[PDB]
Design a binder for this molecule. Structure first.
Ligand SMILES: Nc1nc2c(ncn2[C@@H]2O[C@H](COP(=O)(O)OP(=O)(O)O)[C@@H](O)[C@H]2O)c(=O)[nH]1
Ligand SMILES: [Mg+2]
Length: 261
């Protein structure tokens, strides 16, 4: 009943806004932003439909702002490995699952800038290293800066770039198991990367209290599937694939880590 995710990407892409959007989603029936400068984690226990879930989201500093960005992935990778390390020591000492705190990163949400072009070399290098040790779901950040047509065309280009550079992204096609896993996973692969919009403000729209971005032309409703694809990301992580992500972390990624220990 513990689920951990991490937001990764260049600064100025709405990452910290998206962390708040996740905890503030109207889907939960429970209770409860400068340029982030170091890694810090926020933990809140949310209740979906009577089910209890301790959700931790780790927010990260950006990269790519400097002239030389070499090794800018080291803090993030260091965090992911230190959670694998801590878990191995705990499994050795206290043997039972019920008593081991799981701080392992079960999914990384990687924020791609909405350039409309294609994946930058910097993002390719970062993605190729993250997928080597963690689940990665990429998203088109701040996607309201593109039109509907432009999001779709940009999604396809990125999907092509991922294939060219062999970046196997979640849901990885090799781990498709049962007959109809693919029938539901291909529908998700076709949508990934999700074109997401983040909001930490509530607005009253036609008698409805919704999360949204208030602009001069209207309110962009981030939980409205006609406005953006945030509900797909929110449901993939928390509702439909939470267990599948945790299974892959523990059985593949974590087991691959102890091959060096
Ligand atoms: N247009 C648009 N702006 C956003 C979105 N999410 C956040 N912002 C704005 O982007 C700026 C930086 O957002 P922030 O959450 O700090 O991103 P971070 O630097 O990655 O942590 C702020 O002015 C936000 O209000 C979005 O989905 N669309
Ligand atoms: Mg931030």
């Amino acid at each position: 009943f513990e689920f951990n995710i991490m937001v990764v990407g260049q600064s100025g892409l709405g990452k910290s806004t998206m962390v708040n959007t996740l905890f503030k989603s109207k889907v939960w029936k429970s209770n409860p932003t400068p340029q982030t400068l170091q890694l810090h984690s926020l933990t809140h226990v949310i209740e979906e439909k009577g089910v209890k879930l301790k959700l931790t989201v780790t927010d990260t500093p950006g990269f790519g702002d400097q002239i030389n960005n070499d090794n800018c992935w080291d803090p993030i990778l260091g965090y992911i490995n230190e959670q694998y390390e801590q878990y191995l020591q705990e499994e050795i000492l206290i043997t039972r699952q019920r008593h081991i705190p799981d701080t392992r990163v079960h999914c990384c949400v990687y924020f791609v800038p909405p350039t409309g072009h294609c994946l930058r070399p910097l993002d390719i290098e970062f993605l190729q290293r993250l997928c080597r040790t963690v689940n990665v779901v990429p998203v088109i950040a701040r996607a309201d800066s593109l039109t509907m047509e432009e999001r779709e065309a940009f999604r396809r280009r990125i999907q092509q770039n991922l294939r060219t550079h062999c970046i196997d992204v979640y849901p990885q096609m090799c781990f498709d198991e049962d007959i109809n896993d693919k029938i539901l996973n291909s529908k998700l692969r076709d949508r990934i990367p999700f074109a997401v919009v983040g909001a930490d403000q509530e607005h009253l729209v036609n008698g409805r209290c919704v999360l949204g971005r208030k602009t001069k032309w209207g309110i962009i409703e981030v939980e409205n599937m006609a406005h953006c694809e945030f509900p797909l990301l929110r449901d993939l992580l928390i509702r439909s694939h939470l267990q599948d992500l945790k299974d892959i972390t523990h059985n593949i990624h974590y087991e691959n880590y102890r091959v060096i220990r």
